[PDB]
Amino acid sequence: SDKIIHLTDESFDTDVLKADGAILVDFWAEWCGPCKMIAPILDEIADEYQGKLTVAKLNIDQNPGTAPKYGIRGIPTLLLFKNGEVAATKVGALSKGQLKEFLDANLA
Template sequence: MIQTITKENFAAEVENAGRPVLVELWAPWCVYCRRLTPVLERLSDKLGDGLPIGKINIDDEPELGQKLDASTIPTLYLYQNGQHGEKLVAPSSQAQLEEWINGQMA
């Protein structure tokens, strides 16, 4: 399931989720972000509730964009236990994204 993350629900849906959450920082004008959307949808279908995916529109949520260092988009973070590891910027393929997720969860 892909959901919209805002500053109002960030703590509940990401930091206090009680399970890993994949977060993408994006913007509607970002061509690469739009190309990544079907990859995230396929990943969501594949992983189901095992790994929720949240999208933060940095135009609508500039404070979260700044807090999470979204100087280049798309930027992805995997949150576990309220913390995120290394960011992934503009993955080149679904395989690269899945490999990065698996490495973060190991």
């Protein structure tokens, strides 16, 4: 894309775990309606939170190894990582206004 990291199972450690800051990871799948709903909202957030965080997306079908490590069940699941460590968990779709509030509250 532009500002969004397209993660793989192989690239996850470097991209998320070794990253010096906050990474909002989206676990999602193409068949998942709610996941496709939040995709354009993630684009806006990627834009708007430039220099605060990076948005990263892991498709759980193309990359089946990573999500079991984080107990992911329902999708979309959004995980806020701060320097390799999960700080906050959001399961299910949510609006832009809601995502903003989730991020602002957990980024501090």
